[PDB]
Amino acid sequence: PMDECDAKCQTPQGAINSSLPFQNVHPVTIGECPKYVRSAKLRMVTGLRNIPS
Amino acid sequence: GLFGAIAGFIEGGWTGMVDGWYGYHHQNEQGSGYAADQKSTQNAINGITNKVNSVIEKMNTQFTAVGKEFNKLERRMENLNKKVDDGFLDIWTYNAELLVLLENERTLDFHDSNVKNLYEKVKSQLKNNAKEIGNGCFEFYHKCNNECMESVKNGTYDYPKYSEESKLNRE
Amino acid sequence: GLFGAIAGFIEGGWTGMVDGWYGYHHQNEQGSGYAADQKSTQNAINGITNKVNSVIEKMNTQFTAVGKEFNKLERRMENLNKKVDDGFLDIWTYNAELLVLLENERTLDFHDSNVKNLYEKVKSQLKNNAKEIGNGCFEFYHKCNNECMESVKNGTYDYPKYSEESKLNRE
Amino acid sequence: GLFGAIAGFIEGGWTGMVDGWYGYHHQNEQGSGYAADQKSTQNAINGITNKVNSVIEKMNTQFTAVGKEFNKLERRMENLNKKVDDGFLDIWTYNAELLVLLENERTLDFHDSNVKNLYEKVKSQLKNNAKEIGNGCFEFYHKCNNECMESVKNGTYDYPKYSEESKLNRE
Amino acid sequence: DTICIGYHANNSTDTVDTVLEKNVTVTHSVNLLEDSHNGKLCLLKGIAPLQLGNCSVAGWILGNPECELLISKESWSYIVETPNPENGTCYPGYFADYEELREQLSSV
Ligand SMILES: *[C@@H]1O[C@H](CO)[C@@H](O)[C@H](O)[C@H]1NC(C)=O
Ligand SMILES: *[C@@H]1O[C@H](CO)[C@@H](O)[C@H](O)[C@H]1NC(C)=O
Ligand SMILES: *[C@@H]1O[C@H](CO)[C@@H](O)[C@H](O)[C@H]1NC(C)=O
């Protein structure tokens, strides 16, 4: 459906509101979009190994 | 990691330290507690922040690209169009996942070295005025009050000043 | 590597050690021989196995793809089809070779650190009850029987227990 | 880097050393000056040269490739041709920049370790005949003439030979 | 009296993968992959899409009688077509270079 919203990226499944480098929503897009990958997750560590003691 | 500090010489981290990543814990007659090493922590943060942003910022925006219609006698071109999309997807997926794995391993070694280097900084300051014990701790052979603890943390410990006391306490 | 153990402080490896990658050699009045450090070796194996499998498992299967026929008036499309195949081949060849070279270098540093860390573990256990000599060896200043050798290898060496004997033997 | 030698234990480099990358500075009664460690420097050079050449040599030559003309009813094919070129450009730009950044970081760690290892080599030679001071220097407890300085640099220092003198000078 | 060196720990379950280990809990992490969308068709930088409803591009551009609502639609940011449009070439025939026309109108 169309609605009263705005985005910089639109896929056939709905609009994307994000600044991340990759997406796994859909390969066909219009606008300024994250790059499509088949990855389930791309999580990078910034902190420490979380082992307390 | 390859330096051996994280869950190595240090048994584990401190849930009681909340002002940074790397730091110190102390105990003396005037009190005890945790405090972060702000210089070490901030440098670690800046390095990592630049690394994360490099991975993201060096990526170009995906510009509008949609599939294309082909008629029933254009199957060879439809299949070429698909081949191009599948090839690019395979390249970017492989690279994105492998890059993240390689960088996550390096980040953990980065942190492992930074805490180990902090440990060595103190060992070099204290010399014979303290002994190494497990869990990354230095047990002093002389009374070390709050002014002393700040001096050791700041890299300004006046080693010979405490040498007579430690020689006697060492037996 | 960058830690300096392989053909560094250790002159070279042991062809007489067959039960692992990292380990110990000992000699005392009750005998001599080689034995692997199973904990160190197995952790090294698991790390490497995961690395090799990651490189392979993250790769997708090459799915059927064949060339396409074009007629004599379709040379522009034939050349586009070829360009796509050559471009993908060039990308994957460059990445495959460079990835392997980068990872082989890291694997050798991984191993160089693991043996160096084993060396330091013992140095920290023995303290003043043994001296460092070349080839990665610790020469004891006290009699160290088979029970002692197992204790040192296991990280349970009772340092002060042997301190009177070593003080006398050290002159 | 992660070893902590460059602008770490060493305050900064020597503009007075011109025959290599890594080296020594000395002072004794017979003179003073700088000299490079040719073995350490040449190995560092060979490693880096191979790394740079690997990045360049593993790249294939860009072979003739030009754009293609399309007529006004071939826009779908023109857009496919463009998509292929933009995709390849994006892949190679991302990889080229990221590879260089990752390798520049590793090169600096390579160098940081090499100078630190040189420092440790001397520490192991001198043992109790010299003390560690800041800026990566060893202050001798015995007279060390030019023959001694060459012996230390070459890894042939006869430690016990100077032990009586240093025991007395150490008080 | 003692001074100890250590590092921070918390209650985080953020988990990352590495090349040597497959499930590493960390104190802080960054998500580089976006997996959500809002389920809606939005304006792009203030400009609404052209909704063709039940009309195909051929139906629209030819003036199919049932596509009258698309006559006044002078401008748009993108074109949205239903998966199986029903109102196209109401009088049957071949539409020459249709795919090519769609490719060119999509840029208008
Ligand atoms: C950690 O504890 C704080 C309260 O001190 C809470 O707000 C936060 O959500 C908790 N985080 C996790 C991951 O449980
Ligand atoms: C890692 O955790 C996921 C759940 O997030 C689980 O499915 C997977 O089996 C775990 N794996 C390994 C290989 O340790
Ligand atoms: C589009 O199709 C639906 C389902 O058959 C119908 O209810 C609707 O009236 C049709 N459209 C228009 C735009 O009149």
Author numbering:
A (entry chain A): 273 to 325
B (entry chain B), C (entry chain D), D (entry chain I): 1 to 171
E (entry chain A): 11 to 54, 54A, 55 to 83, 83A, 84 to 95, 95A, 96 to 115
Reproduce the article's own wording on this structure.
While only the H1N1 and H3N2 influenza A subtypes currently circulate in humans, the H2N2 influenza virus poses a distinct risk. The molecular details of cross-reactive and strain-specific monoclonal antibodies (mAbs) isolated from H2-F-vaccinated individuals were revealed by high-resolution cryoelectron microscopy (cryo-EM).
We found that the H2-naive individuals likely recalled cross-reactive pAb responses from pre-existing immunity to H1N1 viruses. To assess epitopes targeted by cross-reactive and H2-specific head-binding antibodies, mAbs from B cells collected post-vaccination were isolated and characterized from six participants from blood collected 1 and 2 weeks after H2-F boost. nsEM epitope mapping revealed distinct patterns for each mAb group: H2-specific mAbs targeted a variety of epitopes on the HA head including RBS, vestigial esterase, and antigenic sites Sa and Cb, while the majority of cross-reactive mAbs targeted the RBS. These cross-reactive RBS antibodies were detected in three subjects (1-1, 1-3, and 2-2), demonstrating that this broad antibody response is seen across individuals after H2 vaccination. As the RBS is functionally conserved, antibodies to this site have the potential to be broadly reactive.
